[PDB]
Each structure stands twice: as C-alpha cells, then as structure tokens.
C-alpha cells in the first residue's frame, strides 16, 4: 500500500543531528553556536 | 435443536394430555365401575331393544377435557389482529383526510 500511516516525526530523524551538533557545548552550559551556514561556504577538501 | 424445534409440535399437546391423565386418575377413576365388560354388554342389549339409553354428556361431566385449544386460540388471535388492520383503514382514511385541514 502507498498511504503510509506513520509518525512523520520519523522522516526527519534527529538521531544524527541533535543540538550537540550545532551547539557543541550545551551540556556545558556556555551555549556556543558553531553551525554550518551554507553549502556555499564549503572551503574545500 | 432437533428435539427443540419438534417440541413446537408436541410438548403443548403433551403438556395438555399429561394434565388430563392427572385429572382422570384423580377425580373419575375412584368412582369408575371396573366391570366394563358387563357394562358394554348391557348396551349391546339396550341396542338390541332399540330403545336403549345412549346418554348425552353434560358440561360438568365434559369440562374434564377442557383444554387450551389453539384451534380457536390461534384463530381468533389472527382475526382480532386482523380487525385491527381493518380498523386502521377507516382510522387511516380519516387521518389522511385530516391532513387537508389547515393548521
């Protein structure tokens, strides 16, 4: 069947990108923001 | 289920004819002349005279065999059920004709 009923909560799985990814010191409370701003800013290999 | 759906046909005539056996063996049996073979031979004599004594039974002698009778019971239930369906025409054509009257 093609009408799948699931928690669409499933389709953006946060198993690999929790806030310890973008905010790497949040369990350390200092709350620093080190994100990857755009696919453009990629400096290179 | 077999012995049930046949009990629609017999238990009621049995529930009856097992109550007469009770009535017979209780009220008439004590006062019943057991010398029937002589009694019958008396009517075979009363018939050879022609002027014998065949007697008709009376209501009180006969009401022993008074029983729920679905010959009548089942019948007049339909007729009374029917003369209600015959009653719901004159009362219907009176109701319909009563719908043409303004409010």
């Amino acid at each position: 069947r093609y009408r799948l009923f699931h928690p669409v909560h499933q389709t953006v799985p946060f198993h690999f990108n929790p806030v310890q990814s973008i905010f790497p010191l949040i369990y350390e409370n200092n709350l620093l923001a080190k994100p990857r701003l755009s696919w453009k800013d990629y400096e290179g290999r | 289920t077999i012995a049930d759906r046949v009990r629609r046909y017999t238990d009621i005539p049995e529930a009856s004819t097992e109550e007469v056996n009770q009535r017979w063996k209780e009220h008439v049996m004590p006062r019943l002349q057991t010398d029937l073979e002589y009694n019958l031979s008396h009517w075979k004599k009363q018939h050879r005279t022609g002027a014998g004594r065949p007697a008709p039974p009376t209501l009180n002698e006969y009401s022993l065999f008074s029983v729920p009778d679905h010959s009548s019971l089942g019948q007049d239930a339909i007729d009374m059920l029917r003369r209600r369906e015959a009653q719901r025409e004159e009362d219907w054509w009176r109701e319909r004709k009563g719908q043409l009257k303004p409010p």
């Binding site: - | 289920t1 077999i2 759906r5 046949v6 046909y9």
Partner: protein, 49 residues
Amino acid sequence: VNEEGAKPMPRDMWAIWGWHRSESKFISRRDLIMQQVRARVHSGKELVG
C-alpha cells in the same frame, strides 16, 4: 472384508446420491437439522409410508 477406506474427509464433497447437483450428499449441519425436524413432525403436505 475388513478393508476400509481411511479418509478424514470424503474425496468428493459435492458427490450426489440422487440425480442432480441439488440432490447433494453432504448437507450443512444447519440444514440437516431442519431436515430431521420435518421428517419427525406432522407431514401435512407429503404423504408418509
């Protein structure tokens, strides 16, 4: 003869014992009962014996 056909179900469930498919052999319990009823009640349509 002692040989019996050991079969848990008859090999042909629609076999007949009359002339026609509606004269079938194996009858649903829920109709075998309404058969044994009429053969064991008054027979005011079909004569008996």
